[PDB]
Amino acid sequence: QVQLVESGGGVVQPGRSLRLSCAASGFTFSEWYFMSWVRQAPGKGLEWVASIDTGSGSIDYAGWVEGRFTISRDNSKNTLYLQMNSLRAEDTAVYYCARDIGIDYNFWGEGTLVTVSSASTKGPSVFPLAPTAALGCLVEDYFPEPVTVSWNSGALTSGVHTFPAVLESSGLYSLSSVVTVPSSSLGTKTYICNVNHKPSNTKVDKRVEPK
Amino acid sequence: DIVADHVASYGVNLYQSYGPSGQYTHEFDGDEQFYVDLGRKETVWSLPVLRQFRFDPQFALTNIAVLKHNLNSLIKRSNSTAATNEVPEVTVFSKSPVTLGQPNILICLVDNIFPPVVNITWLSNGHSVTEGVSETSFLSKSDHSFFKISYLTLLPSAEESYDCKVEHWGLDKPLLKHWEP
Amino acid sequence: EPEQPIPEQPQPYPQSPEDFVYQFKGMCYFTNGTERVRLVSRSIYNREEIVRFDSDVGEFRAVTLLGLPAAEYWNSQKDILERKRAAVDRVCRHNYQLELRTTLQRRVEPTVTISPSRHNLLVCSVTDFYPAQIKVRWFRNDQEETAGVVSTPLIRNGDWTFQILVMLEMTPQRGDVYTCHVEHPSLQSPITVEWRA
Amino acid sequence: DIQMTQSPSSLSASVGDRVTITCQTTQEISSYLNWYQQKPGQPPKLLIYYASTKAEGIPARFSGSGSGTDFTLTISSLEPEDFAVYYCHYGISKVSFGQGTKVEIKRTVAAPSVFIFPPSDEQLKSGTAKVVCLLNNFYPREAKVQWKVDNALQSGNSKESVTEQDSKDSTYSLSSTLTLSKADYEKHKVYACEVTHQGLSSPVTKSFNRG
């Protein structure tokens, strides 16, 4: 299979530096390719950062970059790099890695969030929500933004709404995840919510049941 | 076998696994109009009256990226049938009649080039001549072979003889083609 | 607003060092200016044309067995066909307008020179001319000579100029004047070069 | 660099409608214009290449037209799974993207399934009560959620979160979270959630008493 995997994201203080990597697999950089870094600030559009010809090493940057960012590759390792310096709040975005943009049978990575903040990496506190019926999960006080809620290990999909996180006055994120459940169940079925805040290594599993 | 007053190739797109290498050019009546430098990403016009036009190098880059995909697919469907090296046919001549003292251009046509990977060098008394040396891109042929012409700016002299040296995979050793006034 | 040669687009395929070669040629054939215009887009694997788009056919045709999956898939999509059908006007007819003001207006006047060969041959070198269209004639005292006249084929120099050598085998008697008569589209009136026995 | 602008920035259309999005470039690019589609939380997906050629596997309702500086993406008959932001694109090495056009689905009026979640016993055990209120699968987005604590109207102590429009049924879901101290929570008994919507004849209240 062919895929691009971004890594190196998380939190970073303004003025500091960060180096993202995008590992390729299922093809080799030596076959001549255009590898690109495209970023997307939350709720904003796609913004191209830089491209690199794996063959000739040709580089193009967006006019706004102006030396702050450096794109590079290693054909031996099959990895694309983005070295960012003097980070600002403006650079908080999901950084995507892509192959030959605009051509059929080509790929884009899933992305990696890069949060430019003075704040500390804090973990969440998952609390259950006691209930044609509905149950829930409060995932309170965490930093940075990316958390995954899947419920009982990706088995239930229908009527599962995980709400976007809201930033509290303290500076931490908080969200709820609900699911429509049949009236007949509660004591027969054991619904558990799975929460994984990857930047703090927090895989809290809290099953919800009426008291 | 088509008959026409004029014939153009609004795309001689070429891609090879060796390198890998590519070549993008436009031809009109057998002459090279321009080529896209795929490394520098710029269009280089061959006739100066054509410099009034633009040709987006990213048109050529997208086409060569598609050819790369098709090449890979064809390597799969053909069960890796590779190109067979052809024997190039070299001919050295002059742009104008030779008059000693009067500047001239020694022309080296290397015809029947396949695959399109070749070295064309000039020699004078067994030593390589590097200044005044220029060349065309690989120009297409109807039988899907190529030709390439190399040039050497000269000031003819009775005691100065030159050679056109060609290195191709279809030759046992470098083919040296002599020219003298 | 700068004018630009429009290129033909290769279609992505569905789904001693060793070398694998691929060529895509967007051929445009023109007869009587733009009266008759034909587009032939050739896909070549190594030295074999595998699939073609001939505008006179209006469809992808597999030339070889290798071009089969591509001619079936590309033909099954009206988007691709709708596009290649237009390419005769978008690519061929469009770019000919650009040629009318530049390549089809290029004129380089020939340089006519006569020199004896080093058994009795006068060589008339007609060098550095453009377009190809040339007519060379040999005369011995205003009388045309054809029987003893041989030419080389047209020599393409590669730098947008042609060259031709027109040779005459003769028997010189004192007072004989041989004339190379060259006609070319870039000339006002024929060039006449004399050689005296 | 080449710049691209789309029209409109967003649109709302019903299932079965013909949607038309335009892209205009600052320079002639022949027919080398591509269209991407991005759904929420996913990387962009190539829809069209060469201005009008559909990518392998793309539904027949998706089409493109145009050359030079003016291009158009058409969805001949809109489906609920077509809720996404669409982007025009040019460039394999120097990459330009349009600003994006958000496509929203006009659907029939639906009413919210209201639910009220009393605070977690484990969360109260920490010092604060977060009473949650869920509004499920409603259309349109416009909804009023009023908190009542012992019939007294609340204001300035709740936050709201809305999900993105559903891909299958085109509905929204909402979570209003009332935040109170444990001391103020314990000083009252009746907790209501009055919900106002176009799909409701009269406001639906969901309430709970402590125990």
Residue numbers in the entry:
A (entry chain A): 1 to 131, 140 to 219
B (entry chain C): 2 to 182
C (entry chain D): -3 to 11, 1003 to 1105, 1112 to 1190
D (entry chain B): 1 to 211
What does the article say, verbatim?
We determined the structures of DQN0344AE02 - HLA-DQ2.5:DQ2.5-glia-α1a, DQN0344AE02 - HLA-DQ2.5:DQ2.5-glia-α2, DQN0385AE01 - HLA-DQ2.5:DQ2.5-glia-γ2, and DQN0385AE02 - HLA-DQ2.5:DQ2.5-hor-3a at 2.8 Å, 2.1 Å, 2.8 Å, and 2.2 Å resolutions, respectively. Notably, the antibodies used in this study are engineered variants obtained in the process of optimization of humanized antibodies, yet the identity to DONQ52 is high (VH > 93%, VL > 94%), and the paratope residues are conserved between DQN0344AE02/DQN0385AE01 and DONQ52, and except for Glu28, between DQN0385AE02 and DONQ52. In DQN0385, Ile29, Ser30, and Tyr32 in the CDR1-VL loop contact Phe60α of HLA-DQ2.5, and Tyr50, Thr53, and Lys54 in the CDR2-VL loop contact Asp66β and Arg70β of HLA-DQ2.5. In the case of DQN0385, which is reactive to both HLA-DQ2.5:DQ2.5-glia-γ2 (IQPEQPAQL) and HLA-DQ2.5:DQ2.5-hor-3 (PIPEQPQPY), Tyr50 in CDR2-VL contacts the side-chain and backbone of P6-Pro in both gluten epitopes by arching down into the peptide binding cleft. Similarly for both epitopes, Tyr32 in CDR1-VL contacts the side-chain of P5-Gln. Since P5 is mostly Gln when it is not Pro nor Leu, the cross-reactivity of DQN0385 to gluten epitopes with P5-Gln complements DQN0344, which recognizes P5-Pro and P5-Leu. In DQN0385 as compared with DQN0344, the series of protuberance structures are less pronounced. The Tyr residues are spread along the conformation of gluten epitopes, giving a shallower penetration of the peptide binding cleft. This explains why DQN0385 tolerates bulkiness of epitope residues. Taken together, multiple Tyr residues, especially Tyr100a (Tyr100b, Tyr99) in DQN0344 CDR3-VH and Tyr-50 (Tyr32) in DQN0385 CDR2-VL (CDR1-VL) appear to have critical roles in the broad binding to various gluten pHLA-DQ2.5.
